[PDB]
Short mmCIF file of all heavy atoms in Angstrom, two decimals:
data_model
loop_
_atom_site.label_atom_id
_atom_site.label_comp_id
_atom_site.label_asym_id
_atom_site.label_seq_id
_atom_site.Cartn_x
_atom_site.Cartn_y
_atom_site.Cartn_z
N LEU A 20 15.73 33.78 -15.41
CA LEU A 20 16.84 32.73 -15.67
C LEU A 20 16.44 31.89 -16.81
O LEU A 20 17.35 31.31 -17.45
CB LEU A 20 17.02 31.95 -14.45
CG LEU A 20 18.11 32.38 -13.42
CD1 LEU A 20 17.96 33.87 -12.92
CD2 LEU A 20 18.39 31.33 -12.36
N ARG A 43 -19.93 53.44 -31.49
CA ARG A 43 -20.60 54.46 -30.62
C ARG A 43 -19.99 54.39 -29.22
O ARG A 43 -20.17 53.45 -28.49
CB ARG A 43 -22.07 54.20 -30.54
CG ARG A 43 -22.86 54.11 -31.97
CD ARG A 43 -24.09 55.00 -31.83
NE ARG A 43 -25.04 54.42 -30.89
CZ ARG A 43 -26.08 53.66 -31.18
NH1 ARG A 43 -26.28 53.16 -32.38
NH2 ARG A 43 -26.79 53.19 -30.10
N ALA A 48 -22.43 59.11 -31.05
CA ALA A 48 -21.73 58.81 -32.22
C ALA A 48 -20.59 59.82 -32.52
O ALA A 48 -20.62 60.85 -31.95
CB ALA A 48 -22.78 58.89 -33.41
N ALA A 58 -9.99 72.43 -41.17
CA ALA A 58 -10.06 73.73 -41.82
C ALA A 58 -11.42 73.84 -42.68
O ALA A 58 -12.04 74.93 -42.68
CB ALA A 58 -8.87 73.96 -42.62
N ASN A 64 -16.49 74.60 -46.07
CA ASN A 64 -16.08 74.20 -47.40
C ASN A 64 -17.30 73.64 -48.17
O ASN A 64 -18.10 72.78 -47.62
CB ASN A 64 -14.84 73.30 -47.46
CG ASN A 64 -14.29 73.08 -48.85
OD1 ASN A 64 -15.10 72.80 -49.95
ND2 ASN A 64 -12.91 73.20 -49.07
N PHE A 117 -23.67 87.26 -37.74
CA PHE A 117 -24.01 88.51 -38.49
C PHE A 117 -25.02 88.07 -39.62
O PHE A 117 -24.57 87.34 -40.47
CB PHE A 117 -22.78 89.20 -39.03
CG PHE A 117 -21.92 89.71 -37.92
CD1 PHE A 117 -20.57 89.25 -37.85
CD2 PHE A 117 -22.26 90.73 -37.12
CE1 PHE A 117 -19.78 89.73 -36.89
CE2 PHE A 117 -21.39 91.23 -36.14
CZ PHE A 117 -20.18 90.70 -36.04
N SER A 118 -26.07 88.70 -39.51
CA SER A 118 -27.14 88.42 -40.58
C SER A 118 -26.77 88.90 -41.94
O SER A 118 -26.49 90.11 -42.10
CB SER A 118 -28.50 88.91 -40.20
OG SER A 118 -29.46 88.82 -41.18
N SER A 141 -19.36 78.59 -59.51
CA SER A 141 -18.52 79.26 -58.56
C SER A 141 -19.28 79.46 -57.29
O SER A 141 -20.34 79.91 -57.29
CB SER A 141 -17.97 80.49 -59.10
OG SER A 141 -17.07 80.38 -60.28
N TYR A 157 -16.91 101.78 -51.00
CA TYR A 157 -16.70 100.86 -50.01
C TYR A 157 -16.57 101.55 -48.63
O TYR A 157 -15.53 101.90 -48.15
CB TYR A 157 -15.40 99.99 -50.25
CG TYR A 157 -15.15 98.80 -49.34
CD1 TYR A 157 -15.18 97.52 -49.88
CD2 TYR A 157 -14.83 99.00 -47.99
CE1 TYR A 157 -15.08 96.35 -49.10
CE2 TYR A 157 -14.59 97.89 -47.12
CZ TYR A 157 -14.67 96.51 -47.68
OH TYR A 157 -14.47 95.48 -46.91
N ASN A 162 -19.24 96.98 -36.83
CA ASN A 162 -20.12 95.92 -36.24
C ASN A 162 -19.50 95.23 -35.13
O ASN A 162 -18.27 95.08 -34.98
CB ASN A 162 -20.37 94.80 -37.33
CG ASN A 162 -21.86 94.85 -37.77
OD1 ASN A 162 -22.79 95.37 -37.23
ND2 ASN A 162 -22.16 94.22 -39.01
N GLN A 222 -5.12 80.48 -58.28
CA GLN A 222 -5.30 81.77 -57.87
C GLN A 222 -3.92 82.45 -57.51
O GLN A 222 -3.17 81.80 -56.98
CB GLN A 222 -6.30 81.85 -56.68
CG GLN A 222 -7.73 81.48 -57.05
CD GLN A 222 -8.34 82.40 -58.03
OE1 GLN A 222 -8.05 83.56 -58.13
NE2 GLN A 222 -9.26 81.99 -58.72
N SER A 288 -10.09 43.31 -21.86
CA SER A 288 -9.86 43.84 -20.50
C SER A 288 -8.43 43.47 -20.05
O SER A 288 -8.14 43.43 -18.87
CB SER A 288 -10.83 43.07 -19.62
OG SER A 288 -10.76 41.58 -19.80
N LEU A 289 -7.51 43.19 -21.03
CA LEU A 289 -6.18 42.83 -20.71
C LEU A 289 -5.37 44.22 -20.36
O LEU A 289 -5.87 45.25 -20.91
CB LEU A 289 -5.53 42.08 -21.77
CG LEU A 289 -6.25 40.93 -22.25
CD1 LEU A 289 -5.49 40.27 -23.40
CD2 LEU A 289 -6.45 39.88 -21.17
N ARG A 307 5.30 48.35 -26.92
CA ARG A 307 5.80 47.77 -28.17
C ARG A 307 5.95 46.19 -28.15
O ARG A 307 6.38 45.70 -29.10
CB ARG A 307 7.09 48.42 -28.60
CG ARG A 307 7.04 49.91 -28.94
CD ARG A 307 8.38 50.43 -29.10
NE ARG A 307 8.28 51.92 -29.45
CZ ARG A 307 9.34 52.73 -29.26
NH1 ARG A 307 10.54 52.43 -28.80
NH2 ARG A 307 9.23 54.04 -29.64
N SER A 308 5.78 45.61 -27.03
CA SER A 308 5.96 44.22 -26.82
C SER A 308 5.07 43.37 -27.91
O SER A 308 3.99 43.79 -28.16
CB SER A 308 5.57 43.71 -25.45
OG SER A 308 6.29 44.51 -24.48
#
Side-chain angles (χ1 to χ4, degrees):
Chain A
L20 265 62
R43 302 226 298 265
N64 187 313
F117 295 115
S118 175
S141 293
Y157 187 112
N162 246 343
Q222 295 294 335
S288 58
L289 313 177
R307 294 171 179 163
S308 307

